[PDB]
Amino acid sequence: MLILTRKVGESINIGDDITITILGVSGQQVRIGINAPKDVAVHREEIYQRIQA
Amino acid sequence: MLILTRKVGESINIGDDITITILGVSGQQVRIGINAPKDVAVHREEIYQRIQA
RNA sequence: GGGCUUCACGGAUGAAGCCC
RNA sequence: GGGCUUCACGGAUGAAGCCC
Known part of the structure; x- marks a missing residue:
């Protein structure tokens, strides 16, 4: 794993x-911005596992 | 971009x-954990352009 | 402008509630 | 566990400083 400590308002790439992107803090939450083309998928942990249902 | 608002300790998939994964928050900063195979790259925005120089 | 919480298979720098 | 800041091309659940 590549761990990083990104400042709010900055971004990472893959x-x-x-x-x-990291849009900023939200208390115990964090607002992140995953930007990828529709050539690939992006889902959360509590929703990816919800598909097998 | 696909914006989301996760809690600390939760994760996302791509x-x-x-x-x-979102390992936590540190004031004006955030700590994220990019888990990808070494078959692909991952770099921060402030160093992706550092490679170009 | 700031703090906290909740909703969201959502592709959008998402949404809603409480307090100053 | 909580608050603030700084250093990291680093694939590592990275690092350092101040306070409870």
Whole structure:
């Protein structure tokens, strides 16, 4: 795993076409921004496992 | 972009081979954990352009 | 503008509630 | 466990400083 400590308002990248922005804190929550083309998928842990239903 | 608001300790998934956990928050910063195979790249925005120089 | 919480298979720098 | 800040091309559940 590649752990990083990104400042709010900045971003991270993956592959050559993906970006993972950090919009900021939300208390015990955090608002992240996953940016990828529709060529790939993006879901949360409590919803990916909800598909097998 | 697909914005979401996760809690600390939860996670996100991408490309069916990548997992993006939220390890926690640190004031103006956040700690994320990019889990991807070494078959693909992952770099921060402030150093993706550092490679180009 | 700030703090906390909740909703959201949602592709949008998402949404709603409480307090100052 | 909680609050603030700084250093990290680093694939590691990264690092350092101040306070309870």
